[PDB]
Amino acid sequence: SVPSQKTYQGSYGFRLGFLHSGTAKSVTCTYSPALNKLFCQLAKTCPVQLWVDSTPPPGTRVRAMAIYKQSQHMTEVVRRCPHHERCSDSDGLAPPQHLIRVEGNLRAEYLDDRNTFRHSVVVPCEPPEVGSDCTTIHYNYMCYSSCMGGMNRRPILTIITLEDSSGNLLGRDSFEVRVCACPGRDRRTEEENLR
Ligand SMILES: [Zn+2]
């Protein structure tokens, strides 16, 4: 099967937000609204904002999962390549196979789905800190888009779902991701190609 990627704000008006990091040669993570695409370096911090119109119930969680964007590959589990799954860079919590990690949250849980074998990482949905209007989750992508035997130059999407304590859908948003050496340059190139 294939997880849904349908945008769904739901009852709480759930949607993502991204910083405006620009396209300098030195940028490590940058988001293109025109492409709905995040460009980031390997294992670098990717700040993703969570916005809601009203506060979800205690026990609400936020899950991230990657799928291949092309229909020819959607059924294939997105995982780390044969090299990176063995490079012993575990944070002590993420399984070495998982492409997406959450940085600096000890309540992050990593799921290997017993049925679909797909990987995801889930955290409790926290209210914004005082003086803030949203909450930010920091993600890491632990393989290059180009890694042989892994993503192998195939584009992926990250699907973010807002879930109740049972795992039922409350909200959904998504964005394409390219993990690459020079995010600023590749964003500029792809945005030019678009126009
Ligand atoms: Zn890799």
Ligand 1 geometric centre to CA of 48 (Å): 22
Quote the CA–CA distance of 12 and 80 in Å, as a whole number. 33
DSSP string, 176-195: EEEE-S-HHHHHHHHHHHH-
User: How is residue 134 written in tokens?
Assistant: 């949203």
Between strands 46-51 and 15-17, the pairing is antiparallel
Resolution limit, Å: 1.8
Torsion, CA 85, CA 87, CA 89, CA 95, rounded to 10: 20
73 is in an annotated binding site: no
Quote the CA–CA distance of 65 and 119 in Å, as a whole number. 6
Give phi and psi for 40, each to the nearest 5: -145, 155
98 is in an annotated binding site: no
Ligand 1 geometric centre to CA of 10 (Å): 35
Assigned CATH topology for domain 1-195: Immunoglobulin-like (2.60.40)
Please state the domain extents for the chain.
1-195
Helices then strands (H, E): number in the chain? 1, 11
Which residue has 């229909």 as its token pair? 71
Ligand 1 geometric centre to CA of 190 (Å): 22
Between strands 169-179 and 37-40, the pairing is parallel
Which residue has 């944070």 as its token pair? 91
Ligand 1 geometric centre to CA of 50 (Å): 28
147 is in an annotated binding site: yes
Cα 100 to Cα 57, 62, 93, 159, distances in angstroms: 26, 13, 12, 11
Method underlying the structure: X-ray
User: How is residue 37 written in tokens?
Assistant: 């695409």
* 3 state SS of 72: helix
Residues near 57 by beta carbon (within 8 Å), at least 6 away in sequence: 164, 165
182 is in an annotated binding site: no
